[PDB]
Amino acid sequence: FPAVRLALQNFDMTYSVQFGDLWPSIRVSLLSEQKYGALVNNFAAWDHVSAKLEQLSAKDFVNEAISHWENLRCFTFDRGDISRFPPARPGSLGVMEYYLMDAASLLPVLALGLQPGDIVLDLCAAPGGKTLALLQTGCCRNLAANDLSPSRIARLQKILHSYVPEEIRDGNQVRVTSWDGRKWGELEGDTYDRVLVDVPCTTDRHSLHEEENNIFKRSRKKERQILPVLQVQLLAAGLLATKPGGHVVYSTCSLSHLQNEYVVQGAIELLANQYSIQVQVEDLTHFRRVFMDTFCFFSSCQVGELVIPNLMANFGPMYFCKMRRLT
Amino acid sequence: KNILVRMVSEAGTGFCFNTKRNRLREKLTLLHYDPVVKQRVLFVEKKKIRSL
Amino acid sequence: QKRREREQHIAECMAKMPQMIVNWQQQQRENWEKAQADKER
Amino acid sequence: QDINDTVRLLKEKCLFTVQQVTKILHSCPSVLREDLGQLEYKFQYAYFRMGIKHPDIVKSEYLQYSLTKIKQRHIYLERLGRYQTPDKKGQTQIPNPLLKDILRVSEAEFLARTACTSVEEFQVFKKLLAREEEESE
Amino acid sequence: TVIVERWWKVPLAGEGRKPRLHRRHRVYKLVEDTKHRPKENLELILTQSVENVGVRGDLVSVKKSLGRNRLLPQGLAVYASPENKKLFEEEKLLR
Amino acid sequence: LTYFSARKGKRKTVKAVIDRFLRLHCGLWVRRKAGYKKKLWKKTPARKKRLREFVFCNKTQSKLLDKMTTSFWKRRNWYVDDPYQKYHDRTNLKV
RNA sequence: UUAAUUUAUUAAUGCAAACAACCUGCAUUAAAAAUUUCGGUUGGGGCGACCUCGGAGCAGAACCCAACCUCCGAGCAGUACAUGCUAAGACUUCACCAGUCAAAGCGAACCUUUGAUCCA
RNA sequence: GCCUGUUUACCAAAAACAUCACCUCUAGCAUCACCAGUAUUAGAGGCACCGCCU
RNA sequence: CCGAGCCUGGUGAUAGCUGGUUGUCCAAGAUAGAAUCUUAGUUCAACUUUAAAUUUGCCCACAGAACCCAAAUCCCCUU
Ligand SMILES: [Mg+2]
Ligand SMILES: [Mg+2]
Ligand SMILES: [Mg+2]
Ligand SMILES: [Mg+2]
Ligand SMILES: [Mg+2]
Ligand SMILES: [Mg+2]
Ligand SMILES: [Mg+2]
Ligand SMILES: [Mg+2]
Ligand SMILES: [Mg+2]
Ligand SMILES: [Mg+2]
Ligand SMILES: [Mg+2]
Ligand SMILES: [Mg+2]
Secondary structure, three states, rough: OHHHHHHHHHHHHHHHHHHHHHHHHHHHHHHOOOEEEEEEOOOOHHHHHHHHHHHHOEEOOHHHHHHHHHOOEEOOOOOOOOOOOOOOOOOOOOEEEEEEOOOHHHHEEEEEEEEOOEEEOOOOOOOOHHHHHOOOOOOOOOOEOOOOOOOHHHHHHHHHHHOHHHHHHHHOOOOOOOOHHHHHHOOOOOOEEEEEEEEOOOOOHHHOOOOOOOOOOOOHHHHHHHHHOOOOOHHHHHHHEEEEEEEEEEOOOOOOHHHHHHHHHHHHHHHHHHOOEEEEEEHHHHHHOOOOOOOEOOOOOOOOOEEEEEOOOOOOEEEEEEEEEOO | EEEEEEHHHHHOOOOEEEEEOOOOOOOOOOEEEEEEEEEEEEOOOOOOOOOO | HHHHHHHHHHHHHHHHHHHHHHHHHHHHHHHHHHHHHHOOO | OOHHHHHHHHHOOOOOOOOHHHHHHOOOOOOOOOOHHHHHHHHHHHHHHHHOOOHHHHHHHHOOHHHHHHHHHHHHHHHHOOOOOOOOOOOOOOOOOHHHHHHHHHHHHHHHHHHOOOOHHHHHHHHHHHHHHHOOO | EEEEEEEOOOOOOOOOOOOOHHHHHOEEEEEEEHHHHOOEEEEEOOOOEOOOOOOOOOOOEHHHHHHHHHHHHOOOOOOEOHHHHHHHOOOOOOO | OOOOOOOOOOOOOOOOHHOOOOOOOOOOOOOOOOOOOOOHHOOOOOHHHHHHEEOOOHHHHHHHHHHHHOOOHHHHOOOOOOOOOHHHHHOOOOO
């Protein structure tokens, strides 16, 4: 029994109930190829790369989104189009022109609302992607990124060497640590203004793609079972680290309602009882309407936003919830 | 990933030496010491030896 | 014959060598200057 | 030689009875035009991956349809979860749609009744599957 | 004819001695099958007029099949031996 | 090895030893270092310098090689321009 | 047997050979077979996991060691393209193989994670 | 288990094997089996006499 | 005495397995690392024996051996 088949069995037995008639579409979208967005590097010839992508017929979905939502530029092809993006190559400035990343792993960044001069935390997000997107936002913003895995921290360092110039990377503007997100709540508290908590997840698409280190293999049953506890603890730690009135975004690459809504609800409960701190879930329905053109969203989710994969736009999965710490 | 490539001397000598460069990166031209000529000379990438 | 062919080819390449090195270094420096110009925008 | 090797592929490497071979040839002589290897792949796709048996393969003229169309519809159904390959026991959790409902019908009814999806999604899937096949080969 | 070659070299036997063969010396590789060589032609001297070949006393390169099946068996042609060539040369100079 | 050959009754030489080791007449065996030609691009210059060297064998390694070769390989060879002519003998050795 | 290696032999075809039959050679596909194997650790078995190297526990004070075991990461990446060549003297994972450090000298400039032999 | 039969000579006689009956597959044919036969035939496999309800 | 007859031969098959291995007397003589389709074996090391060459060997009093933050051990003038 391949772990891919085990993951398919679990998804069929759970997400079918969760999604009703949308489950076949989600299933075929997951099993088909993934649509990749191209995020141009703000630290390179951004105008030239954007012109090249527009020649390649991609459009910056981010550009015509902030106008309604109210520097990030990610080019994605139109709905239905399956064209691939040319592989990234080093630019004239000596850095990679663009990053080929899941466009859905950018809505948490755009929903966090990165204001100028705000201190930013990446509690556990260290596969690249969202971290580089946060970096490519402005030249007057300080960010610190942490993750328990030294290999993932090294991957962050490699991508930063590839994209972020030495001048920006070396300074205190970037702070890469490798401590534990759970103990981050004791390492610091009420320090960060904007926090991104991308907990380890079942990463459903990659679980169905790659057999190696598949979370659904029989060996990692204990890890898969303790995942809810780890996710709740990490989200609580992020809510502790964020300042009163600060903003956090909980992110997940899973369709599981257990890992999406129960995690945030349990974190709210635990951090309002064990710590007597009030957190309010902010609405992102405007975000849903703004990005409806580029992504397909599941509406039945009460809290947070779920970008589900569709054949027209194979961009999901991505669940993100915006939470303002009212106390 | 990286590929091992054979930089061949532009000084006319048969001296070649092996370097590593990214596959996506452009073909390499590099100053290197020529033992036969006993002077630093340019070397150009000729062919890809392997993919490491 | 092989030895003298090698010698003359080496001599020709050596005659061209300083100019080639200067041109290559100038190309690298001008690429760097273009990068800084792009940074200026 | 071409006719004989087609018949021998149908009988030996495909285990079709003499009557079944006659029925196939009578129904759709395009099998003879179709090259070997491709024919064997089509038959094994029907047999193993699709779980179909010789009587059904003969009844519904599966060998008449093109391999590209067969894969385009079957893989769509399977990834949608509406079609399941029979287990070692030959059983499925849900009864699979009939070959007439899969291949004989037009794209409209195929996507409306069997797949219950949209034509745009089907076109995107068809292009994706074409890319997948090209990359595999 | 099938022409074969030892895979394993046979050690030299000497002058008057005979080579001693072992099990490995019975392993052969086919270097050529003469039957697959391109066909060559047989040189013949005609004795009687034959359609599309010649008349008499003229050296002709004919397909070996024709030469060995029709011309020679029926006496229409003779081998292009030195003796036959000389005899037909004397015939030509006496005509 | 073969202590008594079936055809001559003689002791045989392990030719794997001859293909790999040089015997200095005094009793020293010289060899190359293993991997001296393998993946040099990923080896440091010091490691490559160590690998490019000709290296002596142990006493027990030398004894094994002596047993595995016959007396022919242990004779005085007066080659014309042998690079090892000076190394064939020991000088100023105390016990 | 969907283990590995074959197809000598038959049976089909194909191409040459002999002028359709028959037969020879060379291929391809099968049938029938033939030959051979069953790594290690964990009461056994299923499902596993691991097998090499490096860092930490794990050894309080030279070394060595708590194997089995716990955690982590590496089959590299970045850099340079003298990050060369040579060479005293040493270390060393308890053998060997292998692996380290290195003065002096020459020459340019002015480094921080593995795999032998054969064979190609 | 249809039956009578058969079997592990020397620890098993049985519900096992066979069996009539039925089904499936293969074969359009001569001078050594099949067979001095020719599709109501021959060979192989399965199943279980039979009879009914679907 | 058939999950594949019997006889002869190859054949003194092979056996890292079991068993055996015959006068007298003296002497030296101990647990030990690595690799291994390897842990019922072997090869190297260590130990062991014999012969030989030479000069130091063992014990050890001080002195000396890390920061992080016990018993002892190593090393060697004397003796
Ligand atoms: Mg002689
Ligand atoms: Mg250790
Ligand atoms: Mg050592
Ligand atoms: Mg009975
Ligand atoms: Mg009875
Ligand atoms: Mg009995
Ligand atoms: Mg009885
Ligand atoms: Mg008997
Ligand atoms: Mg014996
Ligand atoms: Mg005694
Ligand atoms: Mg081995
Ligand atoms: Mg053993």
